[PDB]
Amino acid sequence: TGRPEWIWLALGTALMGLGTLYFLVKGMGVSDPDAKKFYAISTLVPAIAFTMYLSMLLGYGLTMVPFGGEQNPIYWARYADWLFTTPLLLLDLALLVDADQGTILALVGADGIMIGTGLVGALTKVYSYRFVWWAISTAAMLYILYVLFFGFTSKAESMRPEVASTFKVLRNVTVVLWSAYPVVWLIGSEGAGIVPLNIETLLFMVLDVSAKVGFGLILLRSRAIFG
Numbered sequence: 400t401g402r403p404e405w406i407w408l409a410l411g412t413a414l415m416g417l418g419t420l421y422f423l424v425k426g427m428g429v430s431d432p433d434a435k436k437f438y439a440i441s442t443l444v445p446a447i448a449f450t451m452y453l454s455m456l457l458g459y460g461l462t463m464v465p466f467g468g469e470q471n472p473i474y475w476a477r478y479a480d481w482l483f484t485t486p487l488l489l490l491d492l493a494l495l496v497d498a499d500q501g502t503i504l505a506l507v508g509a510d511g512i513m514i515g516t517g518l519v520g521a522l523t524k525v526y527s528y529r530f531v532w533w534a535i536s537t538a539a540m541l542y543i544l545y546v547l548f549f550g551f552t553s554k555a556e557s558m559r560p561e562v563a564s565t566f567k568v569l570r571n572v573t574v575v576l577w578s579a580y581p582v583v584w585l586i587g588s589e590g591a592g593i594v595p596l597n598i599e600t601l602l603f604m605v606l607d608v609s610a611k612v613g614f615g616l617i618l619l620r621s622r623a624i625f626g
């Protein structure tokens with residue numbers, strides 16, 4: 400097939416894979432119980448992404464959805480990835496500030512809605528309705544970000560400055576990166592079709608790699624992960 404976006408898929412695969420192995424190697428050497436928890440979560444995240452990037456590279460996870468008078472190329476494999484990677488990243492942040500079970504449940508639940516409505520919107524055949532689902536998915540994300548900024552930051556103040564300062568950074572990287580996804584979706588292939596798929600794939604790989612390997616490197620190299 401040789402689609403224009405494959406090089407970004409191959410690059411995403413490579414980066415996720417290398418990041419996975421390095422976290423795996425680093426994680427199985429640590430003896431601390433808590434640090435092991437964070438490592439297992441942070442390694443599984445890029446591991447899931449690698450497999451999905453690989454699948455997409457190999458021609459799977461792609462479907463032609465009709466709308467706007469066109470047969471639009473929608474990579475649904477992305478939601479299969481994010482369905483499990485986004486709540487795992489949220490869990491990493493939750494364990495860090497000692498969030499409550501109710502908070503985590505609600506964050507994972509909101510996250511499920513965000514990805515669920517996101518995919519339904521990416522598969523919707525009525526053009527304008529695609530944005531109705533997109534709208535709801537974004538509202539869900541704004542709820543998650545509100546909680547991360549107003550809730551978690553507050554409970555991280557009961558933590559040690561080293562831990563509070565690590566969370567601040569991860570929280571900041573997450574707010575900035577996650578905020579970008581709904582915009583790429585809106586102006587890209589799933590939405591307005593302004594930005595081409597090849598470029599759109601490039602944008603997604605930069606955000607995904609940054610949000611998983613970038614995030615993991617920052618979190619796993621800190622001493623805040625220790626019990």
Ligand SMILES: *C/C=C(C)/C=C/C=C(C)/C=C/C1=C(C)CCCC1(C)C
Nearest residue numbers: 517536537540577580581584607610
């Ligand atoms: C490793 C992957 C990460 C950190 C993915 C984050 C993805 C989002 C914050 C996605 C958000 C979306 C919306 C707000 C609405 C439209 C559809 C989505 C799923 C692209």
